[PDB]
C-alpha cells in the first residue's frame, strides 16, 4: 500500500494535479457543440503531449490531457495468472457501473485495464482536490483487494474439499 | 535488494519487521475474531472480521479464535488473514518485492512447514523465503555458539542443545505445556475464590492478570506455608468492569505448573527435569559446557525469579563438581526476532535462500531438504 | 447446494408422477446427464408402457467388465432388449407395479439411479476380489507379498468414461486403491482446478479428518503401477488423484454410499469451481460498492425537495 | 518410532502412548530390503501406507515410517548413537574370532529374541553379511519361528538335562561364601 509506494504514488499525484487545469471549450469543427477533446483528437493545437508514469515494467500511468478533458489509464500488477483473472473480472465490474462514478470509462484503452476520463464538468461542479485522493486510494486498495480475494479463493477451496471428503 | 522481511509468527504473539533493525515495527496478538450479534445500527462500516489489535480492542462484542494451537497452525484461513494483515495493514510493503524469513518450532509436523512454504510462494508470491528454528535464532541473538536453549512461549516449550556450530537433533526435547495452558490453569484456580471467567474476553483478562501479577517462588512448600499466614502476600487487580479482585497463593501456584506438570493432570517432567534429561542425552564431553550455558528465551520466561529457581533445581540435579550458570537477557522476549534479523543480515546467508525459480522446479518438498 | 445429487432428478420426478397418476400420457423426451451420459424416455407401444434407454460411450468396456449380470440381478425381470442407438433399455408397464407405496417409491429411485447402478460393476468386482485376497492372506500371513503383486499385475482394472478422465482400480489383501486421471480444459477451469486440487490434497492431512481414505496426488508423473497401462499419457497436463480405500471404508454397511461418492467426485469438483466463480462475482461487486462509497466524496451537499415515491413531489409546495 | 511419528502429525507422550506405539510397531513395522530403493518406492507411496486402528477409534496412516524405524538397527546413526549396525557388528565379532572356525560360524547364524521378528530381517541381514564377507564361502541364517521364546526353550533343555543336577547351587553351598559364591562357578 503506502510505506511502499511513496515515489510512484507521489509522482502520479503531482502529474494528475498539474494536468487538471481544464477549461470550457467548444468544438472547432462542429458548431454549437462541445466534446471531450482528448477522446476525439481532431484539433492537435489544444492537445498537450501524452505523459507516462511508471514504477516497474508492469505498472504504467498514461496521462493524456487536453483543453477540457483528461484521460488517465493505469496498469496494475498481475504477478501470477490468478491475479490476472481476478484483476480482469474485478476491473470489469468496476467499469460496469461507471454511471454512478462520473470519472470512469465503460471500456479501457487497449493494453490497459482501466481508463478514467475527467471531463470539464466534473471539475466544474465536483470539487477536484479529492478526485486525485480517490485515484491514489484506489491504486493501492486494488492490489489489497486482489490479495484478499485470492485468500478467499484458497479458503473456500479448503472448505469445499473438507466438506466433500469428510462424508465418506 | 535493500532489506529483507522477517516475521515471527508465534502462537500467541507475532513479531514482524525488517532485517537488521533492533525494534519490532509491528507486534499484535495473533487473534482473529468474528462478531456474535445483530447490529441494528445503520452504517458503522460493518467489517466481517477484525484481526490483531482491532480485535483486541473490540473484544467486547467479538469471539476470538487463535489460529495457531500448540505451535501447529489449525486455521489456515486465519493464518492467511494474519499474514495479509502483517503484509498490508501494518508493515504495508508489497510481498512480491521482499524476501521473507519465517520461524517454526522444532518437531512440528512436516505438513505445517510444507503448507506454509507453499502459501508464501504461491498466494503471496514472495521472491524468496526461509524457515528457521527458534533455538538457533536464540543463539544467534545471544552471540553465543554453544549452549542448550530453553524456549518457552505461548504455544510450546522446547529444548535444543547446540554445541559449537553443531546441533544434536536426537537430544531435542519438546514439551506441550506453555503460556496458554498456564492461563487456562489460572482461570481454573481463580474459580475457587469466587471469580469466574468464561468467555474469550475473560480469557484475555486472565492473561493480563498473569502478565501483571504472576511470579515464580523459590521453595514451593515454604511459600505455601508463608501464604497460610496470608498477611503480606496478597495483591489486588482492577478489572475493566471496575470491580477489584484479590489474588493469593494462586498468584505463584500457576507458574509452578511448569516445574510440576501434574498440576494440570499431565504425566511429564518439569521444565528443569526435561532440560537435565536433554543435556544428559548428549555426549559426555559437551555436558561440561552445556551446563555453563543455559539460555532462557521466549515470553513465558519473563516471570520474576524463574531463572533463580531453575538454576537452583538444575544445580541440585547436576553433580556439584561442575558449576551451573543460567543466562537471560532483559530483552529475551524478542530474542527469537533478534537472532532471525542477525541471520537474515549476513552475507554468507545470501546463498541459503530458496528462490521462486528454485521452488517451482522441485515442488514444496524442497523446504525439507534445504531449510532443515 | 454443497453435495451433487446421486441420480437423475428428472427421471425420479417423472416416474413418481406417472406412478401416482391415474391417466397416463404419451411422452418422448431425451435427457442428458453429467459426463456425456444420455437418457431417452419414450412410450412407443402402449400409453401405459414406458421405455427408458441409457447411452454411454464406454459401455462395451463395462460389458467386458461383467456388468450385464449385475444389471440383471439388480433389475430383475424388467430387462428388455436394447433399443436402437442406446446401450441398456428397460420397459415398465404400470399394471404390474407393487400396490404398496414404498415399493413404488424405491423402484422409482432405483430406476432413476441407473447411472451409478451400471457404473458400479468394477467397484463390486474389486470388492469381491479384495474379500478373496483377504481370506487367502488370512489363511497364511507368509503368502502375502507375491499374491499382492500378482493382483496388482493381473487384476489391474481400468476404464475411460471421458476422453480426459480415467479410473484405474485394483484390489489387494487389505485395500482397493483407485487412481483418477483428472485434467481440465477451458483454461480458466484448469486455473481454478489447480488451487482446488491442492487444497483437496491438504484436507486429508489435517488430523481433523484422518478417518477419510488416504489421498495421493502428484501431477507430471503417474504412480508406479500405471505408467505401463495404456491410455495414461506421460504427464502431459494430467493430474493424478489417488484414493486408498482400506477395509473400514467399504464395510458391508457403507459400500453403496462410498461407491456413489467416489463416482460423483469429479462432477462435484467441477460444479464447485463454478460456485467459486459465482462467489467471486458476488464479493467483488459487494465491495466495489465500498469503492463507490469511497468515491462519493467530492460532491457538495445539495437538497432535493420531496421526491416522495414513484412520482415527482406530488404537490406544488 | 515415537520420534518419527510426530512429523506425520500424530502426538504420543505418555506411557500409555508408549504401549500404543509398541503395539503399532508390533503390527505394522517391517524391514526394507534396500533402503534407497524402498525410499524411492515410498516417494510414490501407492502401496506402502497401512492404516492402524487406534483404541480411540481414530485411524492413523504411516508410510515410510513403517520401515524407517527398523533400519536403526542397521544404521544406528539415525538416533545419534555412534556405532556400527548389527550386521557389521556380527562381521567384526566373527573376524576377531580365531580363524579356524570362522567358516563354521559363517554357516551357523542363529536368530533369537523378540526384536528379530521383523518380517524379512533374515533376508536383508543375510544379503548384507554376504556382501561384507568374502564370496568364497557360503553363509546361511537360521530363523526358527519359535525364536520368541528360544531362550526359555534352551533353559528348559538345560534344566531337564541328566547331568545338570550337579551344576546347581545348594542353599548350604551358597551359605559359605555368601553372595559371591555364584561368580566362581556360574559362568
Ligand atoms: N512479563 C510476562 N510475564 C508473564 N507472562 C508473559 C510475560 N510476557 C509474555 N508472557 C506470556 O508469554 C506469551 C508470549 O508468547 P510468545 O513468546 O510471543 O510466543 P512465540 O514465542 O511463539 O512468539 C504470552 O501469551 C503471555 O501469556
Ligand atoms: Mg515462539
From Swiss-Prot, chain A:
Pfam families found in the cross-reference section: ARPC4 (PF05856)
Location(s) in or outside the cell:
Cytoplasm, Cytoskeleton, Actin patch
**Quaternary structure?**
Component of the Arp2/3 complex composed of arp2, act2, arc1/p41-ARC, arc2/p34-ARC, arc3/p21-ARC, arc4/p20-ARC and arc5/p16-ARC.
**Annotated organism of origin:** Schizosaccharomyces pombe (strain 972 / ATCC 24843) (Fission yeast)
Kindly list the organism's lineage: Eukaryota, Fungi, Dikarya, Ascomycota, Taphrinomycotina
Role of this protein = Functions as actin-binding component of the Arp2/3 complex which is involved in regulation of actin polymerization and together with an activating nucleation-promoting factor (NPF) mediates the formation of branched actin networks. Seems to contact the mother actin filament.
UniProt keyword annotation of Flavoprotein present: no
According to its UniProt entry, the protein's GO biological process terms are: actin cortical patch assembly; actin filament branching; actin filament polymerization; Arp2/3 complex-mediated actin nucleation; endocytosis
The gene name on file is arc4
Keyword Cytoplasm in the entry? The reply is yes
Q: What protein name is recorded for this chain?
A: Actin-related protein 2/3 complex subunit 4
From Swiss-Prot, chain C:
Cytoplasm listed as a keyword: yes
The main place the protein resides is: cytoplasm
Q: Where does this protein reside within or beyond the cell?
A: Cytoplasm, Cytoskeleton, Actin patch
Q: Which cysteines are joined by disulfide bonds?
A: none
Q: One cellular component GO annotation, for this chain's record?
A: actin cortical patch
Keywords tagged on the record: Actin-binding, Cytoplasm, Cytoskeleton
Region forming the signal peptide: none
Q: Does the keyword Nucleotide-binding apply?
A: no
Gene Ontology MF term list? actin filament binding; structural constituent of cytoskeleton
Would you say which domain of life the source belongs to?
Eukaryota
List the GO biological process terms: actin cortical patch assembly; actin filament branching; actin filament polymerization; Arp2/3 complex-mediated actin nucleation; endocytosis
Which SUPFAM superfamilies does the entry link to?
A: Arp2/3 complex subunits
InterPro entries per the UniProt record, alphabetical: ARPC2 (IPR007188), ARPC2/4 (IPR034666)
**Annotated PANTHER family:** ACTIN-RELATED PROTEIN 2_3 COMPLEX SUBUNIT 2, ARP2/3 COMPLEX 34 KDA SUBUNIT
- Family membership noted in the UniProt record: Belongs to the ARPC2 family.
Q: Partners and quaternary state?
A: Component of the Arp2/3 complex composed of arp2, act2, arc1/p41-ARC, arc2/p34-ARC, arc3/p21-ARC, arc4/p20-ARC and arc5/p16-ARC.
| Function (record text) | Functions as actin-binding component of the Arp2/3 complex which is involved in regulation of actin polymerization and together with an activating nucleation-promoting factor (NPF) mediates the formation of branched actin networks. Seems to contact the mother actin filament.
Query: What protein am I looking at?
Result: Actin-related protein 2/3 complex subunit 2
Species of provenance: Schizosaccharomyces pombe (strain 972 / ATCC 24843)
Q: Report the gene name.
A: arc2
UniProtKB/Swiss-Prot annotation, chain D:
Per the record, the gene is ACTA1
Q: What does this protein do?
A: Actins are highly conserved proteins that are involved in various types of cell motility and are ubiquitously expressed in all eukaryotic cells.
Q: Does the keyword Ubl conjugation apply?
A: no
Statement: the UniProt record of this protein carries the keyword Transcription: no
Q: Which family does it belong to?
A: Belongs to the actin family.
- Gene Ontology molecular functions: ATP binding; hydrolase activity
Give the location in the cell: Cytoplasm, Cytoskeleton
Q: Which organism is it from?
A: Gallus gallus (Chicken)
Q: What is this protein called?
A: Actin, alpha skeletal muscle
Q: What are its GO cellular component terms?
A: actin cytoskeleton; actin filament; stress fiber; striated muscle thin filament
Q: Which residues of the full protein are shown?
A: 191 to 377 of 377
PTM annotation, UniProt: MICAL1 and MICAL2 produce the (R)-S-oxide form. The (R)-S-oxide form is reverted by MSRB1 and MSRB2, which promotes actin repolymerization.
Query: Its domain of life?
Result: Eukaryota
Q: Which UniProt keywords apply?
A: Acetylation, ATP-binding, Cytoplasm, Cytoskeleton, Hydrolase, Methylation, Muscle protein, Nucleotide-binding, Oxidation
Q: Which residues form a coiled coil?
A: none
Subunit structure as annotated in this protein's UniProt entry: Polymerization of globular actin (G-actin) leads to a structural filament (F-actin) in the form of a two-stranded helix. Each actin can bind to 4 others.
Tell me more from the record: In vertebrates 3 main groups of actin isoforms, alpha, beta and gamma have been identified. The alpha actins are found in muscle tissues and are a major constituent of the contractile apparatus. The beta and gamma actins coexist in most cell types as components of the cytoskeleton and as mediators of internal cell motility.
* Biological processes per GO annotation: skeletal muscle fiber development; skeletal muscle thin filament assembly
